[PDB]
């Protein structure tokens, strides 16, 4: 009754659909199966199928410190190279732990520069098609080579006690960003405060200026930000690290781009393995692991420093030449499904869990989506939960202004396995019913998935 369930959602919302039980080759149901949408962040379904082929399981990301060049009596004469290598998962405490091991090494000074080697991957740290205005936020940090604690960092605002006076920021010591405040200070119940904006504006070297307007509070504005520039940040969380440990140089920091033979590995930090970190990522629907993965799979198929484009190409080619699937007009813009260029139609996201399906055995794939009712993304799904599926569904979500999809597995109240694909984009409510947006969403998905289950 897809029709019947549409008229739930608001006016002029999209729809393409398909379920199709598991190993079979005609849909149970087909509605606009063909037709292109927006996968949002289903694109990571396909992003963990091409990375365990690509990459496989045990994959590690890798960071090292790197010389170049003899020690004499505890001096390094020559370069320390840092070589990031995209770990998603790399944390200060794993620098500082590094440098520990430079030191215990023998190397207490360093005739020579300080090296932040990026060249793993080249082009822009951020994937055509997203929008400018989130690139300041944690969820679309630029997911560049050098990244320390998820390259996002936390501020509080706070009002001035006497309206009209300059809000002020506070940041911890350790972060190495610089903050300034343009934010004027208003009264309570201000009318100023209607279309006055506080905005953050990025600027070089980690520079971050907030304008705009704050209404007085009596409790300071938690902000978290991306950092814009990882190479730089990591840089000085290096250099703080290496001063602290009492390693001194007399060069400078600089970024070292292009690809270059290896120095001597004198410390080094490993990530979890590969699956581990495709389960956190389909689990929890996390960008940062999936568009780390998608330029390193780029860099591994080709042998080139990892882009975008490469991603892209790669990922194509895996699907058709290990998978046997031909994803034809679709376009692949990223991992993480956030780039408004993705474009897939759901008989095509099909093929792909078909094909996982097929081979879970190999891949240990399903259990790494979110299970209905118990964990991950659909911890929490409403509609799932109402429609009795709790238990019976493995999906990935995807969400964007406007876009609410998923796909993934069902089981069935005959035990028969569907695979599922439900892409609705379109999605808007009248000015006057948003924080309650939702709702049609959630009536949608008990009516759809309550049919689903009960009649198959
Ligand atoms: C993929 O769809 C991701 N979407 C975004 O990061 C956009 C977004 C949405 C809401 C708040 C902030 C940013 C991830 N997938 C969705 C999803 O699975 O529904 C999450 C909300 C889990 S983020």
Redesign the pocket.
């Known amino acids: 009754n897809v029709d019947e369930y549409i008229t739930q959602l608001p006016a002029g919302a999209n729809l393409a659909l398909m379920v199709q039980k598991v190993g079979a080759s005609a849909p149970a149901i087909d509605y606009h199966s063909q037709q292109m949408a927006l996968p949002?962040?289903?694109?990571?379904v396909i992003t963990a199928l091409a990375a365990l082929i690509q990459l496989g399981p045990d994959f590690r990301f890798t960071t090292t410190l790197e010389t170049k060049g003899n020690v004499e009596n505890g001096v390094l004469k020559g370069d320390l190279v840092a070589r990031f290598g995209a770990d998603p998962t790399l944390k200060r405490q794993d620098i500082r732990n590094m440098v520990a091991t430079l030191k215990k090494s023998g190397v207490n000074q360093i005739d020579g520069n300080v090296l932040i080697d990026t060249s793993i991957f080249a082009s822009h740290d951020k994937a055509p098609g997203w929008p400018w205005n989130?690139m300041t936020?944690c969820?679309?940090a630029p997911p560049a080579a050098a990244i320390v604690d998820r390259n996002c960092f936390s501020v509080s605002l706070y009002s001035a006690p006497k309206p009209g006076d300059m809000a002020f920021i506070r940041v911890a010591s350790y972060y190495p960003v610089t903050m300034f405040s343009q934010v004027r200070t208003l009264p309570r119940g201000s009318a100023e405060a209607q279309y006055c904006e506080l905005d953050v504006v990025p600027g070089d070297l980690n520079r971050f200026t907030l304008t705009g307007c704050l209404p007085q509070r009596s409790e300071p504005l938690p902000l978290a930000f991306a950092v814009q520039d990882g190479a730089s940040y990591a840089g000085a969380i290096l250099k703080y690290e290496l001063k602290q440990a009492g390693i001194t140089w007399s060069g400078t920091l600089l970024r070292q781009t292009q690809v270059n033979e290896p120095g001597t590995v004198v410390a080094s930090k490993q990530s979890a393995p590969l699956h581990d970190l495709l389960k956190i990522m389909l689990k929890?629907?996390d960008?940062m692991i999936a568009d780390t993965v998608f330029r390193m799979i780029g860099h591994a198929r080709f042998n080139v420093p990892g882009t975008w484009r490469a991603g892209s190409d790669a990922v194509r080619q895996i699907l058709r030449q290990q998978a046997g699937v031909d994803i034809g007009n679709t376009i692949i813009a990223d991992g993480?499904?956030?780039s408004r260029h993705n474009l897939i139609a759901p008989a095509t996201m099909m093929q792909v869990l078909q094909y996982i399906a097929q081979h879970d055995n190999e891949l240990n794939f399903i259990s790494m989506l979110p299970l209905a009712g118990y964990d991950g993304?659909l911890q929490y799904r409403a509609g799932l939960h109402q429609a009795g599926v709790d238990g019976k569904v493995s999906a990935?979500?995807?969400?964007?202004?406007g876009?609410?999809?998923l796909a993934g597995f069902i089981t069935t109240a005959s035990g028969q396995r569907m695979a599922f694909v439900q892409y609705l984009s379109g999605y808007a409510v009248e000015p006057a019913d948003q924080r309650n947006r939702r709702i049609p969403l959630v009536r949608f998905e008990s009516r759809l998935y309550k049919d689903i289950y009960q009649n198959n």
């Open positions: 949002a962040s289903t694109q990571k989130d936020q969820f679309s929890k629907s960008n993480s499904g956030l993304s990935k979500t995807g969400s964007l202004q876009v609410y999809n």
